[PDB]
Design a protein around this ligand. Structure first.
Ligand code: HEM
Ligand SMILES: Nc1cccc[n+]1CCO
Ligand SMILES: Nc1cccc[n+]1CCO
Length: 289
């Protein structure tokens, strides 16, 4: 199954930078969401979940087809809460109706990471919307109540290795869990992209507790939480090494996250040899906007 990137007709970097800018300006404007976290984190999660359905064995799922717009996928229990991200992006899509749905969703994630002071994420256009019957079934996104072996195995389906898994998980510095979405209870409130997930894993005094949904999670007296799968990265000795690395090298963590996130967003897509080079968008701050 081959998905060839096809550039939205006549569009170039300047067009996509405007889209970026509209998302970034809305991020700035719609500040009260989720107790003043803003929409950055949920947009990152959205870009991950639209990509994380991919199966390297048959090239089903993945970001390309924009299939999150179809009820089967948007109603996936694993996607509960992401409707907020969608509603955020709908006015952007109405203003720029020419962008494909997979391009918009993945660009929303790029824009969110950058505007939250994360690394640059090169991004490529050309995802093309595919029909409802190409929507992957529910159940391809990961469970949070398991160990390191589950995590490793899960991510082989996405062609991610240990360093890529540990790097991508660093996005769990952002935002929070919400009991009514996932059964995890978060207070958390960060909307700045840093390497603190790793620092928190190593530094905090974690206690295995049960939340009000009767699920276990790891909590600290500082008010932080970790999912069991987040904690598994310090149980497994191969993941632990890499957690320590990223805790001790902000820059390394940035570059590794950038390449892993781009790869995640691009899995399943064939880029023609004549395709444009990846775009690196300027932040609002960089533009003086
Ligand atoms: C083992 C892998 C993963 C598991 C089990 C997992 C699980 C979860 C769960 C249960 C939540 C809370 C959802 C809610 O209650 O609203 C969450 C949130 C979040 N996840 Fe993950 N995740 C994983 C990997 C990733 C990856 C790879 C990324 C992106 C690179 C990501 C980005 C996020 C973000 C940014 C949030 C916060 C959303 C918000 O604040 O609304 N996660 N994840
Ligand atoms: N080690 C383990 C065993 C079972 C479920 C989850 N985890 C991960 C951390 O709590
Ligand atoms: N662990 C986790 C997972 C997802 C979002 C937030 N947090 C808390 C901060 O690390």
């Amino acid at each position: 199954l081959v998905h060839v990137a096809s550039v939205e007709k006549g569009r170039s970097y300047e067009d996509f930078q405007k889209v970026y800018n509209a998302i970034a300006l809305k991020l700035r404007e719609d500040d009260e969401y989720d107790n003043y976290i803003g929409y950055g984190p949920v947009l990152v999660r959205l870009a991950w979940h639209i990509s994380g359905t991919w199966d390297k064995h048959d090239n089903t799922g993945g970001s390309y087809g924009g299939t999150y717009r179809f009820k089967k996928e948007f109603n996936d229990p694993s996607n509960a809460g992401l409707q907020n991200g969608f509603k955020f992006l709908e006015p952007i899509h109405k203003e720029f109706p020419w962008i494909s749905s997979g391009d918009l969703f993945s660009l929303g994630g790029v824009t969110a990471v950058q505007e939250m002071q994360g690394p640059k994420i090169p991004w490529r256009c050309g995802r093309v919307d595919t029909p409802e019957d190409t929507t992957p079934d529910n159940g391809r996104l990961p469970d949070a109540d398991k160990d390191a072996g589950y995590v490793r195995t899960f991510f082989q389906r996405l062609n991610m290795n240990d360093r890529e898994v540990v790097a991508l998980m660093g996005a769990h510095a952002l935002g929070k869990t919400h009991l009514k979405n996932s059964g995890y209870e978060g207070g958390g409130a960060n909307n700045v992209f840093t390497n603190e997930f790793y620092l928190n894993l190593l530094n905090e005094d974690w206690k295995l507790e049960k939340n009000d949904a009767n699920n276990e999670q790891w909590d600290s007296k500082s008010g932080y939480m970790m999912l069991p799968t987040d904690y598994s990265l310090i149980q497994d000795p191969k993941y632990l090494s890499i957690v320590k690395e990223y805790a001790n090298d902000q820059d390394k963590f940035f570059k590794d996250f950038s390449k892993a996130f781009e790869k995640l967003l691009e899995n399943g897509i064939t880029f023609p040899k004549d395709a444009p080079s990846p775009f690196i968008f300027k932040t609002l701050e960089e533009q003086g906007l």
